[PDB]
Design a protein around this ligand. Structure first.
Ligand SMILES: Nc1ncnc2c1ncn2[C@@H]1O[C@H](COP(=O)(O)OP(=O)(O)O)[C@@H](O)[C@H]1O
Ligand SMILES: Nc1ncnc2c1ncn2[C@@H]1O[C@H](COP(=O)(O)OP(=O)(O)O)[C@@H](O)[C@H]1O
Ligand SMILES: Nc1ncnc2c1ncn2[C@@H]1O[C@H](COP(=O)(O)OP(=O)(O)O)[C@@H](O)[C@H]1O
Ligand SMILES: Nc1ncnc2c1ncn2[C@@H]1O[C@H](COP(=O)(O)OP(=O)(O)O)[C@@H](O)[C@H]1O
Ligand SMILES: [Mg+2]
Ligand SMILES: [Mg+2]
Ligand SMILES: [Mg+2]
Ligand SMILES: [Mg+2]
Lengths: 427, 49, 97, 446, 439, 443
């Protein structure tokens, strides 16, 4: 039961009428932010527009990433989701903009269905060109097959009387084992005999699996699932990630459009979330203007706890939240407010409860006072050491003396800075 | 098709002129080289040409 | 022919195979017996890790396009490779362990 | 086709003009910019003529004033068969390709070539296929009877055609076309003939095809390719895979000059046609001085498509230098380019554009709501209102009324912040955020 | 039928005894520069002395690129000519100096001569046995016959050629041409003699060749040493290991060593001594050289004292600038003084109103357009007032506007409207400085 | 004989005009003036062919166009063959596929040469006739022949197998290694020279050898150390000397091959020769390279390193101080400086005359004096370049001699560097400044 700074957020807790309550879904306060977030939730649920931009901005310890996780959880698993940090964009194998596009194409999902054809049964004979003979529980069929999977079977050390499993669509070959009809041939044979399969050798099934566009693009450009010697021999030659031409994206778009027009698939827009976007370079920032103003780009959400700052990559322009006005114009802004004392106390007690800790009311008052004095994250971090300190004295509850002892043991930012200022050698 | 049609006209074999010599390294020594390149040049072909 | 291909290359210049053999020659009789386990060649390393690769290799690709696995090495029913070269490729490569 | 949900320029459709190159006050999904529209139409006529190459045109103006809109309009009015490449400034700074190499590749992308290959193709419904073995008398036995709507005849094999037909499991009675110049079987679909036996295929063959009757037909094939495809194909053993993967890797120049000479030969021979494509670059002020220097020479070549550029800033420091050059561009390029200026919009124009977006986004706008949206747009920006209109819908049918009203617009305005209000709040709350010097006041108390 | 600021310059227009008139070769004015550059053409055409450099300086829109193109036209299509810009020297695959060295080798070409005897339907083929050894089986000889047009002839050869033609997968009745130099033979195709062998086929009809059974042809090839050394370094072959590896290797060019340069120099030296090859020095053009760097300039000096250095020509428009890479070095045209000491300088001068008007007349004439006298006279007015290139580019939109109202010629109000529609640099920066809305 | 040269910037320099006691002649082999520098170069040369002490650093100073590279060319021509001389500039050391230290190490190993002696025994062109046979392991004894010598030799099963691969009629003459190696086809005899109506590229008619086929001949082999390391760098790396992908060879081949070459030297079958590594344009280089050179000077296999530069006190590439001579003081401490003074009017006349006669240009005396006057005014390279264009313009005037007016026309045609600077000063507005400012509107 691992808990880490989250998992107490079970959703925005918004009413069906679009009015958020005070305490619900592991959330307290931020009524305006929650209402706007639910509005954006219904926006993406509409699945009619594309390339919309929302930025939420506020100081630290204001649950911005918590809000992003909340909207992601409220949307559910049907919609694709991919959290991101700004620093992850910079790579050495491919240019930054190409990685941005790669993450763009991974943020939209496609629900597809197809028929899987398989042939399974007992190995009867192997006549070279290649014809094979399969024996089932009741049926029996002979199959002519490509020499590639024949050689794969040879590599799979398939013997006589064995039972195998073949996927017709992909040519996947797998041997289940050998039939128990001829099993006790040896006293201590290493091969594990398995019972004969039941049913016809020919079988058809249906799947409903889901894929994203980036998966289709990388599958088309890079085949990395081969079985015969030529396949993996070729695919091991170029391990490095390369660029992806735009014409490949256009071809993939055409084929998925044909698939959905025929009526065996439908498109699912998704959400791309970039956290701490203040550090992004100017080139990526001006690339976002072109990337967003497109036809397929999904909605995007940004986070930045900044003010009058210079964006990285330049040295002149001072812009709010570290975002130049050009990207600001195509942006929606959500304001997050700092908390207050009673909300701090409620947060602390809720975090204690989700950590299954017993806390005495005076200890909660001390924790709230200290959190207002220094920060909420400080108290949230140090509550667990208080719990273990109480556990050392074999007490399941939290006492004020224990909290004071823990605060003595572990420092905060202001005390450490004050010690550093009066220090012998930059302690 | 529109490109590989003038190879029957303007092709020049650099290998015929021994200009791909780098690939022809690991099979030759020189004791036959100079001796033959002189003897076949004068005395072997004076009785033939 | 005498003035073009009689002797043009066997005149040293760059290199000569006998010189490479004289240089790439070896003055060692026998050493590193514990090649056994001191070196532990990776061909033995992969098979020594059989159980973990059976018990851990789980993930599969989400999508794959057939006719590109074979086309990657430039051999298909309509390809630019030679007639017997394509078959000799895997005739030399199928025997690989 | 052309799958898409909604684009920021989904409403612009190929500009709007008369035969006299006069822009209508409202045409094909945009309003205003009369002189800019006329200049764009002039450039379009230049591209249609195709007798001029290597001309530079630059679009300038305030941000959010029909720049990319004009680019999309000229792209749509250009239509198919004329290559159009839109490229951002930051797409060329690659670690795999040199900047000049990428610019060269883009320029070669924006050059259309039309070719015509003539092949003798024979189609028609078949009945069965005859493939025999080798016997004493001759090589093989073969007699294909092929049927059509009008007249049905019989042909014979060609030794290789047995192998070609045995390559795939060809079912008896399908419409397959053969080009003897190539020998490629085109199994378009099964034989229509009578559909009484062909009424329950289970999809397949896409409603087959009605046979056309006559069989001896030689139809020319028109293929459109660009210089980049040709040189990439020539570069490697299998250039098409490199084209579809992007690992070309600094194509050599002598291939390019040979291609230029050979395509000139084809043009004189009448085999090939040259189409003057268009290259478009956005926010070119993000480019480097080396790129500008390379452009300065690459423009003057005969194989140079018309290049259009759009910027936002004015009197800025060109990247790679330390002097604030005018327009954020080198002066020589400004000398060699032609500048198109776009002016600020009006309240009437912004309200028309908002209404166009409304009808485009399936948004029903009340007159008072339109007035309030126009007031907000003229107060702050076009895009602010152009996003608020979409966002207010969710509020509209969160109260179960399909048509939006004033209250929904007020709620959206009070819920989502504007740049001016946001900057005012940030300035009044400077201690709450992270300073440029890393000064943060996390502690509310003390 | 299209032009881009050029292709109306037909040579340098220098008469015999080294004189340039006013209007010739689509060229007007700047007589002395044309005289000097014609002298340079003479020096290159001497083909005696190589390794020089020449830099020409001037203001923008002066015709430097036009001067270089005139040089290239005057030299002709035999001597190689490699235009270049400073930026292309930079690369992400090899060193800048190295790329300079490939360009250096690319500048100079070589013309080579060689005669070839080739033998060209096929009457029959038959091999001739006991190997008298441990070998399994072989043929003592192979006898074949070729039909051709100018009579047929039988041919006796070695089972190696029989094997090669078997690998070519050629029918017994077919047209075949066989190379006598090495024995390489390819399937010419199904000959016209065996037409309509069956009802339907796919093989090409390949009309039977008209000529002797054996034909000798003279081949003259013009290549550069840059093709030579890359051909030497790059491996070839079929199914051999390095051959497939290189086929999949993505053959990026990497740092050609000097040993290949020495070897190819020795081989071409002995071939020209034999008298079969002739070396044709070329000219390499670097446009806008101010974008180079100190490293390139120093290695440029070093390569400029080299043995086979082609004559190079440089272009620039900078003044008392600081050469890139450093900041304390202020040198003319952004070229380090040590390099400046190693070449000559050709001056170019701005034109006048009359010269600009003549340029406009020439440019209007080449594009098959009609310009009214007053319209051309006013075009010269803002040609001098703003720039030559602005008025040069203005012509095509004016022609389009004339096409709008169905009039072939160009009138005064048409060009006035064109000027109003499209702004110049001065007006544009005036609007930029006047406004404050980020424009 | 192998001079594919058209010309060279300095091709008149063929060695140094010295004598038995190394006295610089006033004029010899395209070289004039700077007698002290020539004597120092001769001392360094005699030191090099002494070949008994390594790791010496010598630095050549001087103003531009003073002929410092002329001395390097002269000494290179003087040493001639059998001694490597690597002329490397300072810019090629900057590789993005190889560390600068690695490139310097490769250059250092290049400048050292090693020669070895090896002897092979072989019978050449004597395989006459094959007598196959009872059955199995047949052809166990066949004769050998030349144009002057014959012998019968018995063949074993191993040699039978060797002959089985690429079997030949044996009526030709084939060379086979008597040293327990393999066989090597030589070609065909004259008997079947008229047997083919078409030719290939596998076998060519070969002469029957003269004299005894058996021969145990010794061969000397010369190669530099860099090649001998790169050959053992991988399984096969002969392309590395050609392609150039050395791949930053790790420091295990180097020490082991140093031990191998020491063993070969002690055996006496290999002799080393210390060449000369010359670096032009040294003033641009990184301080890391300078420290690496500082250390590498101490190695036993350190060739004589000669540097050339012209800059005075200036910033060094990699630091923030204006060091004298463009080099760190540590490097200057362990080097030898050979300064070169400027050139004189008589020396200018001699050099210009040598240049003129080098390109077989007939020159009038007065034109030569005018060229000397200009080369006194401006750089000497200016006139050394104007000579050819003056000859060309004189040719255009149909007079073989280079008259004075032709030289004056050539001078008026091409601008001086100082003249160009002055004209730019007069027309600053016309040209583009370093601030991006320029004016094109005349009015
Ligand atoms: N309404 C809330 N309910 C529960 N936890 C909250 C709430 N608001 C903030 N938090 C906590 O505050 C922390 C700050 O969240 P986050 O946005 O990741 O950092 P910051 O706010 O500094 O950007 C989170 O770990 C979250 O658990
Ligand atoms: N004439 C117009 N008609 C309709 N919409 C327009 C028009 N001009 C601009 N727009 C709107 O402005 C947006 C384009 O802004 P744009 O001017 O391209 O920004 P930038 O100036 O940064 O390139 C589009 O989303 C479009 O809806
Ligand atoms: N004397 C001339 N005759 C014809 N065209 C000229 C002449 N001088 C300049 N031009 C025109 O000027 C252009 C070349 O400008 P150029 O002087 O090379 O610019 P820059 O000075 O920047 O190199 C050519 O397109 C050419 O048409
Ligand atoms: N003392 C000399 N004797 C003969 N030629 C000389 C002499 N000094 C200079 N030169 C000539 O000057 C030319 C350039 O000299 P160089 O060595 O490049 O000058 P720097 O010392 O500046 O490098 C050479 O081609 C050479 O022929
Ligand atoms: Mg956070
Ligand atoms: Mg825009
Ligand atoms: Mg120019
Ligand atoms: Mg110096």
């Amino acid at each position: 039961t691992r808990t880490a700074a989250h998992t107490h957020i079970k959703g925005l807790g918004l009413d069906e009428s679009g009015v958020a309550k005070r305490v619900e879904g592991g959330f307290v306060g931020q009524i305006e932010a929650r209402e706007a977030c639910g509005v954006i939730v219904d926006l993406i649920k509409a699945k009619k527009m594309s390339g919309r931009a929302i930025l939420l901005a506020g100081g630290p310890s204001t649950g911005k990433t918590a809000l992003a996780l909340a909207i992601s959880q409220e949307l559910g698993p049907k919609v694709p989701f991919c959290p991101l940090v700004g620093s992850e964009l910079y790579s050495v194998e491919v240019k930054k903009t190409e990685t941005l596009m790669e993450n763009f194409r991974r943020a939209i999902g496609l629900r597809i269905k197809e028929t899987k054809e398989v042939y399974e049964g007992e190995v009867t004979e192997l006549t070279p060109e290649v014809i094979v003979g399969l024996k089932s529980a009741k049926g029996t069929k002979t199959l002519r097959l490509d020499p590639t999977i024949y050689e794969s079977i040879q590599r799979e050390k398939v013997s006589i009387g064995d039972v195998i499993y073949i996927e017709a669509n992909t040519g996947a070959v797998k041997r289940v084992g050998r039939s128990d009809a001829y099993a006790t041939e040896f006293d201590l044979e290493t091969e594990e005999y398995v019972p004969l399969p039941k049913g016809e050798v020919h079988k058809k099934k249906e799947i409903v699996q889901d894929v994203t566009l980036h998966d289709l693009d990388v599958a088309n450009a890079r085949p990395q699932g081969g079985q015969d010697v030529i396949s993996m021999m070729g695919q091991l030659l170029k391990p490095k990630k390369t660029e992806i031409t735009e014409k490949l994206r256009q071809e993939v778009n055409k084929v998925v459009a044909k698939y959905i027009d025929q009526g065996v698939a439908e498109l699912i827009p998704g959400v791309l979330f970039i956290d701490e976007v203040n550090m992004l370079d100017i080139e990526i920032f001006t690339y976002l203007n072109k990337a967003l103003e497109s036809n397929i780009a999904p909605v995007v959400v940004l986070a930045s706890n900044r003010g009058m700052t210079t964006v990285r990559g330049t040295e002149d322009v001072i812009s709010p939240h570290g975002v130049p006005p050009d990207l600001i114009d195509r942006l929606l802004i959500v304001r997050t407010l700092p908390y207050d004392k009673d909300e701090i106390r409620t947060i602390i007690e809720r975090r204690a409860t989700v950590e299954r800790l017993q806390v005495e009311s005076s200890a909660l008052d001390l924790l709230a006072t200290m959190g207002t004095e220094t920060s909420l994250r400080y108290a949230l971090q140090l509550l667990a050491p208080c719990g273990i300190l109480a556990q050392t004295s074999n007490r399941k509850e939290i006492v004020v003396n224990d909290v004071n002892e823990a605060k003595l043991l572990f420092l905060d930012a202001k005390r450490s800075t004050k010690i550093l200022e009066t220090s012998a050698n930059y302690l | 098709k529109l490109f590989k049609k003038n190879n029957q006209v303007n092709r020049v074999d650099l290998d015929f002129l021994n200009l791909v010599f780098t690939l022809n390294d690991k099979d030759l020594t020189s004791y036959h080289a100079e001796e033959i390149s002189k003897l076949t040049c004068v005395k072997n072909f004076v009785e033939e040409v | 022919v005498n003035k073009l291909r009689c002797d043009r290359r066997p005149i040293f210049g760059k290199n000569l195979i006998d010189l490479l053999t004289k240089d790439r020659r070896v003055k060692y009789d026998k050493s590193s017996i514990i090649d056994n386990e001191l070196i532990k060649p990776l061909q033995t390393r992969v098979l020594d890790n059989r159980k973990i690769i059976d018990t851990f290799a789980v993930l599969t690709p989400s999508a794959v396009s057939l006719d590109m696995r074979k086309l990657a090495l430039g051999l298909n029913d309509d390809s630019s490779v030679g007639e017997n070269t394509r078959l000799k490729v895997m005739q030399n490569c199928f025997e690989v362990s | 086709k052309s799958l898409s949900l909604i684009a920021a320029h989904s409403h612009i459709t190929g500009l709007g003009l008369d035969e006299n190159l006069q822009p209508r006050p409202t045409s094909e999904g945009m309003v205003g910019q009369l002189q800019a529209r006329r200049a764009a139409g002039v450039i379009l006529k230049m591209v249609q003529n195709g007798t001029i190459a290597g001309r530079a045109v630059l679009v300038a103006g305030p941000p959010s004033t029909g720049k990319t809109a004009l680019a999309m309009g000229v792209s749509q009015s250009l239509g198919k068969d004329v290559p159009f490449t839109a490229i951002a400034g930051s797409e060329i700074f690659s670690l795999e390709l040199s900047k000049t190499e990428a610019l060269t590749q883009a320029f070669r992308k924006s050059i259309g070539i039309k070719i015509k290959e003539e092949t003798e193709l024979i189609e028609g419904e078949v009945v069965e296929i005859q493939i025999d073995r080798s016997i004493t008398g001759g090589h093989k036995q073969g007699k294909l009877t092929i049927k059509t709507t009008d007249m049905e005849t019989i042909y014979e094999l060609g030794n290789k055609m047995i192998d070609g037909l045995t390559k795939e499991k060809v079912l008896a009675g399908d419409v397959i076309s053969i080009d003897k110049a190539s020998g490629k079987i085109t199994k378009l679909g099964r034989s229509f003939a009578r559909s009484r036996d062909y009424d329950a295929m289970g999809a397949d063959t896409r409603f087959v095809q009605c046979p056309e009757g006559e069989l001896q037909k030689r139809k020319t094939v028109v293929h459109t390719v660009s210089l980049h495809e040709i040189d990439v194909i020539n570069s490697r053993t299998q250039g098409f895979l490199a084209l579809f993967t992007g690992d070309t890797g600094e194509i050599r120049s002598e291939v390019r000059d040979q291609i230029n000479t050979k395509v000139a030969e084809w043009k004189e021979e009448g085999k090939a046609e040259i189409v003057p494509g268009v290259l478009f670059i956005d926010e070119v002020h993000m480019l480097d001085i080396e790129c500008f220097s390379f452009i300065n020479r690459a423009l003057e070549d005969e194989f140079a498509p018309i290049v259009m550029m759009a910027t936002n800033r004015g009197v800025s420091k060109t990247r790679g230098t330390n002097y604030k050059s005018p327009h954020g561009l080198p002066l020589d390029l400004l000398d060699r380019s032609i500048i198109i200026t776009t002016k600020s919009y009006n309240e009437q124009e912004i309200k028309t554009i908002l209404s166009i977006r409304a009808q485009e986004e399936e948004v029903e706008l009340s007159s008072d709501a339109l007035d309030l949206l126009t007031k907000t747009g003229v107060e702050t920006s076009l895009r602010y209102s152009s996003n608020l209109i979409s966002v207010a819908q969710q509020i509209a049918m969160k109260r179960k009324n399909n048509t939006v009203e004033v209250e929904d617009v007020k709620r959206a305005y009070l819920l989502f912040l504007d740049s001016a209000r946001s900057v005012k709040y940030v300035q009044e709350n400077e201690s709450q955020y992270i300073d440029d010097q890393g000064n943060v006041q996390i502690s509310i108390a003390k």
